[PDB]
Design a protein around this ligand. Structure first.
Ligand SMILES: CCCCCCCCC/C=C\CCCCC(=O)O[C@@H](COC(=O)CCCCCC/C=C/CCCCCCCCC)COP(=O)(O)OC[C@H](O)CO
Ligand SMILES: CCCCCCCCC/C=C\CCCCC(=O)O[C@@H](COC(=O)CCCCCC/C=C/CCCCCCCCC)COP(=O)(O)OC[C@H](O)CO
Ligand SMILES: CC(=O)N[C@H]1[C@@H](OP(=O)(O)OP(=O)(O)OC[C@H]2O[C@@H](n3ccc(=O)[nH]c3=O)[C@H](O)[C@@H]2O)O[C@H](CO)[C@@H](O)[C@@H]1O
Ligand SMILES: CC(=O)N[C@H]1[C@@H](OP(=O)(O)OP(=O)(O)OC[C@H]2O[C@@H](n3ccc(=O)[nH]c3=O)[C@H](O)[C@@H]2O)O[C@H](CO)[C@@H](O)[C@@H]1O
Ligand SMILES: [Mg+2]
Ligand SMILES: [Mg+2]
Lengths: 373, 373
């Protein structure tokens, strides 16, 4: 039973060591390729290599390619293995192309949909359960759900970002929670689904651990959208093929809140700045809330209602002003990072990430409490 | 029998139209990403977008992802379908990473080996014939051959390059020749191997046709190593899984000659310039042979022997000189493009590519003559 899992653990540890070693080896290449960026929440104007998710993602693929023959050494699970790797690999690829080319916002939705196609087709060919428990047969709409799941998880991680070790950290907690959940369900019942998930979650964990080694505060490298795209698809892939997307989405609680809280800014009903990461008080050294200021006359009818409702619900900190240019509204940037800075006041970057990571652990523990009483 | 082939042809035509439309749409993004280069054989110093093989390659993948359920709508060929796409997709990815990052020469060998792993494992799991006809069982060495085949075809195309429409053009002739060969063998005998090859060769053809639309003289876009990597793996994949790598390698005759003729320069026994593309006589407008000048005292014992042998065989045009700096040897750059310019004299770029393409057609016709008497 654990014979291939042993081999998977062995190659995943080698993959950790590979990721830790290779990340600083390709440093030059990324900086030369202009694949870098400043640490926007630090005074240092130096450029730190970006898109390092491509190196962990690459290690992850090569690990699993070598692993492929072991579970076989029957095709119903083997199809799902090569199928899920196709989807993950295509996603690391289109994700990296997006990092290199900076495609229009439409592709943040089209690329995950594109890459998710092998998962859908494997589910189609291996005769997948289109019926859902609330007892409803969604049919074609179930495949729309599977497509959208990949789109969701990638962007949900990507919009809960911008502080040292958060993106890679939250994924690290999520994969660990999936691993723990798989091991519990490996004791009986649906087992071939959970031994399957472990085959991707063990290598995803140790490679991301190798990435976080160089990403954790102070960040020596940045993960890029390549990592957020990669993570999202790996999670959506194991959720779908393991048939536990419901349970997996509950492990996405901080990501789901942060998304809906961001919805008025994403939909531009309230002006949305390109970067909604907190400000650094250079005197304090700690992070402070970021704000989006705008002319109140330019704001839409629906936008004034949402902002008034969210302020009264003790969620958004709004600040009215009136200069020579006119009357302005300096409202709080709608994200979970800022809401923690609203409630708990200014927080140092290292503790802020670690706080959201703890909040992530809390949610996983709540899900495990829901599911096992 | 042709029901899925009809669907494959339909999506491949849509893929052509997609490639022609999208190539000029992402132009901005590539130039902005510094993914471009000058037309080194033209006076214009403007920068033309590079790595457009990524857009044809991307279209190729999405085409085939949509095609996946059709041959099914049994897993022995379905595994080989998802397996070959994994290898091709990983290769387009690592090929593009190489275009973006400019990795050391070692990776021009490591990336194709890395990406070829799913093919090997599919061949392993689906119980592939390790025995070869000269009757010898190569076993592990057969897998070494499969790995090296991908390495060969990618670089063999990549070193027979540097003139408008050559890289994409030679692949276009090769895929057409594989298509013709498949259709002949579709009449009987081994058929499931040739209907399989057609599934990748039809979409490879029409996407490359869309690429060559913007690449053909005068090049409006450049294909990049991404295309050479992509092409090589798609050809190695169909050759391996179709069991016709021998026949396929004979379609690689101009690529095999150009490789062995380049061997003294590649091995640096004779100095090798980074670009061995012909020179443009600005007065003539036509292309002229390129040369590699070096001090004869610095040349190795083996290098003097090779150069003397190759000169007497009427292959290399050597020119001795002696300035104030010392005695120099200005020998001809060892490539098939230059050998055609040695034998046929200066040739215009458009006719030179078209001449090598004709030479490619000639070789395919020779192979078809070998094989069918
Ligand atoms: C090695 C050196 C290193 O960097 O170690 C750091 C630990 O990293 C984390 O906090 C990273 C946190 C790592 C936690 C990931 C896994 C979390 C939970 C798994 C269990 C979930 C089950 C429910 C400490 O550095 P510091 O700057 O002091 O903070
Ligand atoms: C459309 C407009 C266009 O560009 O068409 C050009 C044709 O392209 C080729 O020559 C490209 C050559 C295309 C040949 C590819 C297929 C070749 C052979 C297939 C059969 C092989 C069987 C053995 C003509 O342009 P020009 O500058 O005059 O040369
Ligand atoms: C709609 C939405 O919510 N978009 C967010 C998303 O955009 P988005 O994903 O587009 O932004 P990027 O992936 O380009 O951001 C990466 C850049 O952010 C900065 N950075 C990133 C990580 C880190 O620990 N420290 C750091 O300073 C660096 O300049 C880095 O180069 O993520 C950004 C931070 O990643 C947030 O500003 C954006 O508001
Ligand atoms: C060992 C070997 O044989 N290496 C060759 C290989 O290197 P290599 O593959 O490394 O070179 P590249 O792929 O970077 O060359 C692409 C560049 O070549 C020029 N270019 C390319 C295509 C074209 O039609 N016109 C044009 O001018 C452009 O500057 C383009 O940007 O291919 C080059 C041309 O592709 C040749 O010079 C090199 O000698
Ligand atoms: Mg991002
Ligand atoms: Mg090249």
């Amino acid at each position: 039973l654990p014979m291939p899992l042993l081999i998977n653990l062995i190659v995943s540890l080698l993959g950790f060591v590979a990721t830790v070693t290779l990340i600083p080896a390709f440093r030059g290449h990324f900086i030369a390729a202009r694949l870098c960026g400043q640490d926007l929440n630090k005074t240092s104007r130096q450029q730190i290599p970006e898109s390092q998710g491509v190196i962990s993602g690459a290690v992850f693929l090569i690990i699993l390619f070598c692993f492929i023959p072991f579970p076989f050494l029957p095709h119903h699970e083997f199809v799902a293995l090569i199928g899920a790797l196709l989807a993950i690999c295509c996603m690391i690829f289109l994700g990296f192309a997006d990092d290199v080319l900076n495609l229009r916002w439409r592709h943040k939705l089209l690329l995950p949909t594109a890459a998710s196609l092998p998962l859908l087709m494997v589910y189609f060919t291996n005769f997948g359960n289109t019926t859902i428990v609330v007892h409803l047969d969604l049919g074609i709409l179930y495949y729309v759900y599977m497509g959208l799941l990949a789109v969701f998880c990638t962007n949900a991680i990507n919009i809960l970002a911008g502080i040292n070790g958060l993106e890679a950290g939250q994924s690290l907690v999520i994969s660990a929670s999936i691993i723990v959940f798989n091991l519990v369900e490996l004791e009986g019942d649906c087992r071939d689904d959970h031994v399957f998930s472990l085959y991707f979650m063990i290598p995803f964990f140790f490679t991301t651990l190798g990435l976080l080694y160089h990403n954790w505060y102070p960040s020596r490298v940045f993960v890029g959208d390549t990592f957020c795209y990669f993570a999202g698809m790996t999670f959506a892939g194991v959720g779908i093929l393991g048939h536990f997307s419901k349970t997996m989405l509950l492990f996405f609680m901080p990501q789901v809140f942060n998304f809906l809280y961001s919805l008025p800014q994403l939909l531009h009903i309230i002006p949305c700045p390109r970067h909604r990461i907190p400000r650094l008080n250079i005197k304090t050294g700690k992070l402070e809330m970021s704000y989006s200021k705008f002319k109140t006359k330019s704001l839409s009818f629906l936008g004034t209602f949402i902002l008034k409702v969210a302020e009264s619900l003790q969620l958004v900190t709004v600040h009215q002003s009136e200069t020579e240019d006119g009357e302005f509204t300096e409202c709080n940037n709608m994200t979970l990072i800022n809401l923690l800075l609203k409630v708990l006041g200014p927080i140092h970057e290292r503790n802020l990430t670690l706080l959201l990571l703890l909040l992530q652990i809390l949610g996983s523990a709540i899900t495990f409490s829901i599911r096992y009483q």
